[PDB]
Amino acid sequence: ATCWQALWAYRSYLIVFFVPILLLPLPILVPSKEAYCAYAIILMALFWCTEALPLAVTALFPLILFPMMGIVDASEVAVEYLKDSNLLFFGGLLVAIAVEHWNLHKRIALRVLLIVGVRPAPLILGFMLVTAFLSMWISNTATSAMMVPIAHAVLDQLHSSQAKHLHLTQCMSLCVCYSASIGGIATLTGTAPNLVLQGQINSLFPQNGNVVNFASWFSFAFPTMVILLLLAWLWLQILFLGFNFRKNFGIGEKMQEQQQAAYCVIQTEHRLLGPMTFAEKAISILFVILVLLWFTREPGFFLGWGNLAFPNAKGESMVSDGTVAIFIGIIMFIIPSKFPGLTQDPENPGKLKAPLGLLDWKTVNQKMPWNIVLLLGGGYALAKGSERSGLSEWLGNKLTPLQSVPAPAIAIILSLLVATFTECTSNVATTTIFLPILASMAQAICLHPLYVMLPCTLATSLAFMLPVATPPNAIVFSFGDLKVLDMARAGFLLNIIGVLVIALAINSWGIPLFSLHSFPSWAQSNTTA
C-alpha cells in the first residue's frame, strides 16, 4: 500500500530514469544520424508531455545530445538559441511588463469587459476574431506577444468581479494561440510558407502565368480560414466548457441575473479608476505607435518604410519586427515616469532625485519569462539538428511511393504526414524541401501541381500539438497556468479537422479557380509524353 504510494510519489524520477533506457533500441539497432535525431525528438516530446522536468530544462537537451552523438558540434548548436523571433518575443514582453506595472492593463481589461460583456463563449469568439484579423497583416509572433497578456488581464478581472476559473483560463489561452496561427494562412504575405510556395512555383515552372498571386490566394484561403476558425471555437468550447451551450452563452434565469451583478461590479471598478496618469498616457501612445510601425514595415502588397529606408541589395528590409520591438522597449527606459517627479534624497539630504523610467531593470528581471526564451531557442536547435542530420530529407523521400493511390486520398495522407512532421521540425525548411519532390511526383502521374503543393503549403501552418512548432505555441506558457498535455489533447483533434477542411477546399471551389482538372501546358516536360 505505502510501497505503491512511494512509487507514485516518485513518478517523475522514474520517468526521467526509464524513458531514455526504453528508447535505446532505436539508436542501437539502427546506427544512423537520422535515428539519433529522431531519438532526441521523441525523448524531448515525452519529457515535455509528462512534465517530468521543467520546460526550460528539457529545452537545453540539444546542447548535450547533438555534439556527443555527432550531429553538430557545440559552437554550432549554441548559436540557435537566440534568433530574431525570440528577440521579438523579448521586446514585446518588455512593453507588456510596462503596461502591467503602471496599471494600464486593468483599465484596458475593464473597457473590454464593459464593451463585450460577461458571457464566456462570445468573449472567447471576440478574442479569436480579433487575433485572426491581426495575424492576416502582421507577424504571428507579434500578434501572439501582444494578445496573450491582454487576455490574461481580462481573465483576471473577470474572475475577481465574480467574487470554472481554470478551465475558462485554459480555453482562452489556447484560443488566442490557435487563432494567431490560423489567421496567418488567409493572405499571401501572412506567413512565410506562402511566399515560399509562390517562389517555388515561379522557379520550378516558369511561364506559369503568375497563377498564384494575391487575389487568387485570398479567394482560395479566406473561406478555409473562416470555416477552420469557427470549428476551432466550437471544439475548444466543447472540450473545456461543457456540452451545454446554454450556460456557455449565459442564457436563462439563475444565469441572466448573476451576470448583472458582475457587470455592475465591473462598472463600479471602472468608475473607481481616476483620470489617466502621465505614465499611462505615454505607454498608450508608444503602444499605438508600435502597432502602426508593425503594419507598415514590409506589407508585401505595397512598399513599406523598411523597403524605402534600410534596403539590402535585393530591396528587402534589413530591419525586422523584432528591431522595432527592441527599439520601443529601449525607449521606455529613458522616458521619465512622472515629469516634475523630484523626490528629496533620503540618503543624501541636500540633493534631489530624478524619477525612475517607465521601465527599470529589477522589474524587468522579476517579471520576464526567461524560461520561454529558452523554450523557443530549444525548438530552433531541434529544427536545425533535424535539417543537418538528414532526417527531413529522409521524411521527404517517403512521399514518392505515394503514387499508387487515387488522387483525393494522396492529398489527405500528405496533409496528415506534413502536419505531423511539422510538429517536430520547423515549417519553412520543410516547405523548401518537400515541394520539388511533390512537383516531380505529380508530373510523373499526370496530375496537376497545386493539387499536391497547395495542401502541403497549407498543412505546415496548421500544427497544434507541441510548443516546438510555431512560436505562438510556446508563448502561451508565459503565465504558467497551462500544461503541455492540455495543448496536446486539444491539438490532436484540431490537426485532423484542419486536414478535412483543406480537403473540402481543394475538392470544392479550388478546382474552378485554379483549373485543377486539366494538367496545364506549363507543367509539361520531356519526361511526361
Add this chain to the structure above:
Amino acid sequence: ATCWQALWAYRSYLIVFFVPILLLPLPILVPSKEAYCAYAIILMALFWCTEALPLAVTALFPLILFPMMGIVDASEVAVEYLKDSNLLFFGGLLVAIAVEHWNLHKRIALRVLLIVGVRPAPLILGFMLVTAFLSMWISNTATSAMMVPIAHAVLDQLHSSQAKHLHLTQCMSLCVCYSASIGGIATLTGTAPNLVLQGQINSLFPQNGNVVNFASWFSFAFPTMVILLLLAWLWLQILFLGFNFRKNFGIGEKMQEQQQAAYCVIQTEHRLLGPMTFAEKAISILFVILVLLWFTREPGFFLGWGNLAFPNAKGESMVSDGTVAIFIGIIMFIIPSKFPGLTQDPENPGKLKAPLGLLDWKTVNQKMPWNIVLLLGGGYALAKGSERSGLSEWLGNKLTPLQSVPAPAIAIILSLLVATFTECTSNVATTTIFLPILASMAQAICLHPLYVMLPCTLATSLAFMLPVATPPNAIVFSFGDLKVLDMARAGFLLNIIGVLVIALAINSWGIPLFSLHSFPSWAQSNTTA
C-alpha cells in the same frame, strides 16, 4: 540654486539625450561603414562608463544600430547573443546557485578563512595565485565562473565576522577578474591567441623548425606572468586600500588583537555547523567531478577524452567546456535533495510527496544573473560588427607606416595600440588579422619576426578596461557591487604596466632563447635581398 540641483538630479537623462548628438559629426563628416561601427563603439563605451542606462540595456544597442546603419541585417546580428562561452557562464552559475542554496558556500568560506586567516592583502594574494594557477590549464571563462562566487562568499563571511567593506569587496572582485586573464598567457594552450600564433608561424614561414613549442613558450611567458601578477597585486592594493602596507598586512597592536576576535568568531561559526547533509555531499562530489572533467577534456599537450570520444574530421573535440557545464547543471535537477524525503501531501491528504531536486526552476529564476548573459552577448555582437564593417582591417593597415621607427619603440607602440584595439573588439579575430601584416612589415625592414609577433600575441590578452573584451571582465558584474568606472580606473594603468613588462621580457631573456638578433634563414623571401 535649485535650478542646478534639478539639472544635477536629471544627469542620466541629459547624458542619454546629448551624448549621441555630440558624436554625430563622425558619421556625418566621414560617410563610411567603419565610421558607423566606431560611432556604435564609442557610444556604448560612454553609456557603460557613465551608467546612464542599465548594463544589459546598453548591451542591446547593436540590435538596433547595426541593421539601420547598414552594417549587417537583423537576423545576422541576433545570432551573436548566445555563443558557447555565454552558455558556459550559464552552466557554471547553475552550479553556484546550487552551492549557495544548500549552505555549502558558508562551509567553504569558513574553511578558507580558517586556513588562510584574516589579513586583507595576503588573502587577496592567495586568491590571485589560485586563480592564475587554474587558468593555466582550463578556460579563462570557467575559472572566472567558479572563482567569483567563492570570493563573494568569503567576503560576506569576513564582513559578518567583524560585526573598508566596499573597497575590499571591489579589490577582491577585480583581483580575481584580472588573475583569470593574466594566468592564461603562461602556457601555449592557456588561451586561444597563443595557438593562433603557433598556427600562423607554421603557415607563413614553413621550415621554421617548430621554433614556437610548449617548452619555448613556457620559458618565455611564465616569468612575464609572475612579474605581471605581482605588479597587479601591488597596484590594486595601493588603489583600493591605502598606502600604508601595515594595516594592509594587519601588523601591529590595535590590529593584531582585533583580528584574534574575528578569528575566534570564525571558529565559533564553523563549529556551529553540524555534519554535512545529503545535499552538501552530492553537490561536493558533482563539483569535484566537473573540475576534473574540465582538466582532461582537451589539454593540448596530451590527448584528452574529448579527442578520443567525440572527435570531428580533424581530431578536435565536438564537446566543449560549456557542454560539460550544462550536463552537470541538468543532472542537478534530477537528483533528489533528500533521499527518504517523503512529505505528507497537504493539498491531497492521502498521498505522499517526493522531495525537490538540488535545483528547482523558481530558485534558478530568482538567482540567475540574466543581465550578464545579455552583456556577454552584446560584446560578441559588437565584435562581429567590427569585423564585418572593415574596421579591424582599417586598424590593421595603420601599423604599416610604423616602419620608420627604431625597433624597441615599434614593439612598445604596437603593444599599446593592440591592447587599446582589443578593448573594443575581440581578440582571436585581431590576432588572425594583424599577424600577416606584421610579418610582412618585419620582412621589409630586415627585422626578425616574433620581435613584433610575440608582443602582438601577448598584448591581446592583457586588456583590462571594459566588459566587452575578455568574458571574465563581464563576469565580475554578477553580484552588482562594482561599477564600470572602478574597472576602467584600475585597468587603465594595468594596461601600461603590461606593455612595459612585455617590453622587458622581449628585450631580456627573449633575445637568447629565440635568437632575436639574427634575421634567420627561414624568413627570407625573394623580396628581401
